[PDB]
Write a protein that binds this ligand. Structure first.
Ligand code: HEM
Ligand code: HEM
Ligand SMILES: [C-]#N
Ligand SMILES: [C-]#N
Lengths: 156, 156
């Protein structure tokens, strides 16, 4: 299952939306990427079953920054047309988790935390119309879940 | 990992929203459950990797109806306070998929199809304010992903 094939799925998912959704989403994510990373590790480190796989040092020195870079990569893909590069990266991230047996149910819960908080931030974005915010939230759920799908290829 | 423990997670997720979000979501889902099932199997049977696991007869005679019942169960849980019953059901559904080795990445893509189409339907619901529709879409993503999390427990 090659990256140029997986890139079609990413391109097709994003093509359901306009560049306006891509930009609105990428703007809220870049403006809040540290706060989104904070919320992700706040949610995970609180569950003892998730904390099992995480050290405070690993989060502080590596993963907190990596999560910000992951978010930027996901939301840069469609605007910069870097589909093949992004899907290739998602596949490798998935392989990292599968190799150390991160329970897939915690990966999906993590994805949900990011989708929820990004869509909460979009709802409060005064620069978007009701219709534009709505379309952007649908894109955020779609593109995040596409990234999660690529990551979850490693688990089969 | 008992059902009364898993029920806390479902209750907590739904408690982030008001009964207004629960009802708006349950109303759009019940009104469109057959059309949502249609869209789910339209998306899956189109991918040859997913069609591998599905016969037209299995979809026509069992799963199409089961998907409608799954949707009704997910959106009935918070309004009827049947948390323990719903999480118990989700766990068993997950076990069905894990036993016949349904790739988890296809389960997540399926969940995304339902979230996308339900939120598309909510956007067009003239009876909801912009703010109410927004809150309801966030609930739909959260509660669907909670159901998916419960299903994915079987894969670890
Ligand atoms: C949406 C969900 C997730 C995303 C986007 C994500 C992101 C990432 C990324 C980008 C890396 C690679 C870091 C690097 O090598 O630069 C990574 C690795 C890792 N992730 Fe996640 N992750 C997710 C879910 C989880 C969950 C649920 C856990 C644990 C409960 C977890 C624990 C880890 C661990 C332990 C590593 C390896 C760190 C190291 O030892 O190199 N991740 N993750
Ligand atoms: C959100 C995702 C999904 C939901 C909500 C869901 C729902 C269900 C439910 C409720 C059942 C139990 C039916 C019964 O015993 O009454 C079931 C079984 C089954 N599902 Fe799914 N499913 C999902 C994803 C998938 C995917 C991605 C595939 C395949 C590519 C798949 C294929 C099957 C098969 C083959 C069975 C067993 C049917 C039988 O032989 O008894 N499902 N699913
Ligand atoms: C992965 N943090
Ligand atoms: C499962 N259809």
């Amino acid at each position: 299952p090659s990256p140029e094939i997986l890139a079609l799925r990413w391109k097709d998912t994003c093509a359901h939306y306009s560049p306006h959704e891509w930009v609105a989403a990428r703007n809220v994510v870049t403006a809040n990427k540290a706060a989104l990373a904070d919320y992700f590790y706040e949610c995970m480190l609180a569950d003892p079953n998730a904390a099992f796989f995480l050290s405070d040092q690993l989060v502080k020195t590596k993963l907190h920054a990596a999560m910000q870079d992951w978010l930027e990569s996901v939301y840069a893909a469609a605007p910069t047309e870097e589909y093949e590069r992004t899907v290739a990266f998602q596949r490798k991230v998935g392989e990292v988790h599968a190799r150390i047996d991160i329970p897939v149910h915690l990966v999906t819960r993590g994805a949900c935390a990011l989708i929820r908080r990004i869509c909460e931030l979009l709802d409060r974005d005064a620069s978007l119309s009701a219709a534009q915010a709505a379309a952007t939230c649908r894109y955020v759920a779609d593109v995040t879940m596409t990234a999660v799908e690529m990551m979850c290829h490693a688990y089969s």
